[PDB]
Write a protein that binds this ligand. Sequence first.
Ligand SMILES: CC(=O)NCC1CCN(Cc2cc(CN3CCC(C4CCN(C(=O)CN)CC4)CC3)cc(-c3cc(Cl)cc(Cl)c3)c2)CC1
Ligand SMILES: *[C@@H]1O[C@H](CO)[C@@H](O)[C@H](O)[C@H]1NC(C)=O
Ligand SMILES: [Ca+2]
Ligand SMILES: [Ca+2]
Ligand SMILES: [Ca+2]
Ligand SMILES: [Cl-]
Ligand code: NA
Ligand code: NA
Ligand code: NA
Ligand code: NA
Length: 472
Amino acid sequence: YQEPTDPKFPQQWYLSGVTQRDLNVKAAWAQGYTGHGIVVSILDDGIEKNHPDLAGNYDPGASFDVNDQDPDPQPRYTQMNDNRHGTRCAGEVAAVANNGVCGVGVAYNARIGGVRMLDGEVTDAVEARSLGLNPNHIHIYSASWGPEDDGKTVDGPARLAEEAFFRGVSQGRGGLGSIFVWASGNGGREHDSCNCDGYTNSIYTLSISSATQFGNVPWYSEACSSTLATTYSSGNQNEKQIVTTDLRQKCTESHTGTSASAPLAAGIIALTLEANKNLTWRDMQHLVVQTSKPAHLNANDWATNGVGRKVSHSYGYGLLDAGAMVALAQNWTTVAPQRKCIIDILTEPKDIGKRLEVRKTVTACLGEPNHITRLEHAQARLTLSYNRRGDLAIHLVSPMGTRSTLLAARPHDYSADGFNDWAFMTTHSWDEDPSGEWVLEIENTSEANNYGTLTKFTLVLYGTASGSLVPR
Ligand SMILES: CC(=O)NCC1CCN(Cc2cc(CN3CCC(C4CCN(C(=O)CN)CC4)CC3)cc(-c3cc(Cl)cc(Cl)c3)c2)CC1
Ligand SMILES: *[C@@H]1O[C@H](CO)[C@@H](O)[C@H](O)[C@H]1NC(C)=O
Ligand SMILES: [Ca+2]
Ligand SMILES: [Ca+2]
Ligand SMILES: [Ca+2]
Ligand SMILES: [Cl-]
Ligand code: NA
Ligand code: NA
Ligand code: NA
Ligand code: NA
């Protein structure tokens, strides 16, 4: 195997490193996996399809302009180069290799397109038409953005966009399911808590956070239980950043944020899908859980779950490992059909006050076709009132003792609107048996005499009843 000769490949430290602080992509390339036959679309502000490092891989069938309602996602050029982000992300996935220009994509033989959908008013219809673009041609969608990262918003896909997610994972990709890769957010300095973003909090999105070059949690990171894994991105000014294609046929070394991590993940997922084109959308999440690596990622919340895997709310299961992903994909056995066990927990509304604990012992649909002994995602779907939402912290403890933070205190969130059947999701109990006692904790983290009521708590378990591995 001959590594790429591109002039900035040496600066792509998260791919070209020799110090074990990288995504282990060369190992996948040397196994023969470069993205050939895979199609990725960037949902963003457009794609410079004539960029010298993108044109060779550009796929019009992976592209559309929802903002102007035409097929051509070319960005709108402005003095401030506002609409450059999609071009930066596209190069991370699939910049051409060995062509003397900039660097390379993770999946440098994949085909790449873009949906121009952020340069205009983003409505539910715009979102749905983007998520549902050509779902039997595009394999993987990469989205780096969501509701405002102001630390006070709770929002997610409205009806058309949620229907697009369920159509995508159900009928997309020949019934194997569209793979939606999502950035978990850039709201760290606002103390944002990313389960309040219904796109990344979805079970249908494969959610990705960031690590700095020196292995730390970047200033912009949001912690939450819905994140699955991590890729490298930017940090402080002594740490390197992401090197990729830029608007006006240029090359940048200063692409940043969690919004630069999701495209790298999408590229790794493209390599993995080349290694086994029959992987379902759920198979892909299982591969990420099993192969991601905590080592050398610094956080104070690493905890071992019930099946022996280390998990963090900043990093999920750790750093994506492309070589390990493609190796495990090759002989992967398709997971069993997804079961869903619905448990209505409360017998009466519960005053929250300063603190509320709800304990319930469940059988996880014992005796029924939705019996789950092997969890995937779990949700606590909560309906509650409270006078100042951001003073709440919410935790969910599984029968195996795994504490998932569903919500951390958000100081800027002054809302009096509470949560209206909000489906807080955790990945941290993946592969655990969910039978037994679950504990929900709701706490007022402020000294204020805050007040409200929990009126509904639905525990929703997804998973299967076969195929478990010995714990790690
Ligand atoms: C009842 C009903 O109909 N509600 C409809 C709502 C419509 C809006 N939704 C949230 C939402 C709102 C938004 C737009 N917002 C404004 C700009 C934000 C930055 C500014 C910096 N920036 C650049 O500068 C680029 N050059 C990037 C963009 C992001 C936030 C985007 C999404 C979204 C959805 C999908 Cl699918 C994929 C993706 Cl990538 C992004 C999602 C929630 C539902
Ligand atoms: C894909 O997986 C399904 C489910 O196990 C199986 O029935 C089918 O034969 C597989 N297809 C290929 C091409 O391997
Ligand atoms: Ca256009
Ligand atoms: Ca190149
Ligand atoms: Ca956020
Ligand atoms: Cl469902
Ligand atoms: Na975001
Ligand atoms: Na997700
Ligand atoms: Na534990
Ligand atoms: Na149990």
